[PDB]
């Protein structure tokens, strides 16, 4: 006797709302999409000092969830014939031809297996010239293709090459090509002056208001800002790729194709992928220190999971994000906060909600 919208709101109140007080989080947006119906739940303030409530217009930083858009851009360029994932970066960034990094192929860059790229660029690598010099001075460590080490410079370089192959800056790849193709009208690499009123403050661990600062190859690694409606639309596209023209449909499918495994995690393009149903521990393991911060041997896919799910966490200094979707259940969920909370809490709360919603 309780309508489905209320049942979903109750589950979000039970599992996500307590996080606001536990982690002193000013604002949160949680969305669920099920069977093409969208449910949006907003809590708290996008700006504490302005007493401005979080709402459907609130723009949040996606952090590493941005890599999903970079992966989609790569799938689009590949399916248009602009790149092959077997190409090396010097084919497009000519200044890298005949350098050691030109031995790594695009898929290895997108999926973090160059064997010598860390989580972040060095602090002093700032300018375009400094980024190029960094890649020219790169030298292999581990055998190329054997070890996964999660890396912003790695997928950032992939993104730059994708942009080169499409003859536009990366920001314009997303804002002029990818976002319009996915029907996202409130998603940005650079938030225009006319929308800054909707851009939430992030909040640091001292609850002080902040927003992301510029950095090297920031756009492809962690550069996107979006709203909850737009992120529900992005989940919708991933749930229904057959609803887009062939090139974008194939681009989306490319991001869903698992490439190798590390234990129970399948590395797709941008997305992490898992057999469904996935135990909670499987999902937590994907965000463990061992997987996120250390190098790990990759193995070929053995079980190609027929029934599967995908997720991705992301953070910036002042924001947290989690997105997850389950194709055969026709369901997905997005969480956006303007303060980081532990990845494990995001995964746990989403797991409880998604498993309890009636089919």
Numbering used by the authors: 1 to 359
Reported in the publication:
Class C Acinetobacter-derived cephalosporinases (ADCs) represent an important target for inhibition in the multidrug-resistant pathogen Acinetobacter baumannii. The class C Acinetobacter-derived cephalosporinases (ADCs) play a significant role in antibiotic resistance in A. baumannii. β-Lactamase-mediated resistance to β-lactams can be overcome using combination therapy involving a β-lactamase inhibitor coupled with a partner β-lactam antibiotic. Many ADC variants have emerged, and characterization of their structural and functional differences is essential. X-ray crystal structures of ADC variants in this study provide a structural context for substrate profile differences and show that the inhibitor adopts a similar conformation in all ADC variants, despite small changes near their active sites.
For example, ADC-30 and ADC-162 differ only at position 220 (Ala220 in ADC-30; Glu220 in ADC-162), and ADC-33 and -219 differ only at position 222 (Gly222 in ADC-33; Asp222 in ADC-219). In the apo X-ray crystal structures of the variants (resolutions ranging from 1.24–1.89 Å), the Ω-loop conformations show more variation than in the complexes. The two variants lacking an Ala duplication in this region (ADC-30 and ADC-162) have Ω-loops with nearly identical conformations. In contrast, ADC-30 and -162 form a tight turn that restricts the active site with the Leu216 side chain oriented toward the interior of the enzyme, and the side chain of Asp217 forming hydrogen bonds with the main chain amide nitrogen of Gly214, both presumably stabilizing this turn. Overall, the B-factors of atoms in the Ω-loops are elevated more in the Adup variants, suggesting that the Ω-loop is more flexible in this region of the Adup variants: ADC-30 (loop 20.4 Å2; B monomer 21.0 Å2) and ADC-162 (loop 23.0 Å2; B monomer 22.3 Å2) vs ADC-33 (loop 20.8 Å2; B monomer 18.8 Å2) ADC-212 (loop 21.8 Å2, B monomer 19.7 Å2) ADC-219 (loop 41.4 Å2, B monomer 35.7 Å2). Overall, the variants that do not contain an Ala insertion showed little to no change in their Ω-loop conformations upon binding of the inhibitor MB076.
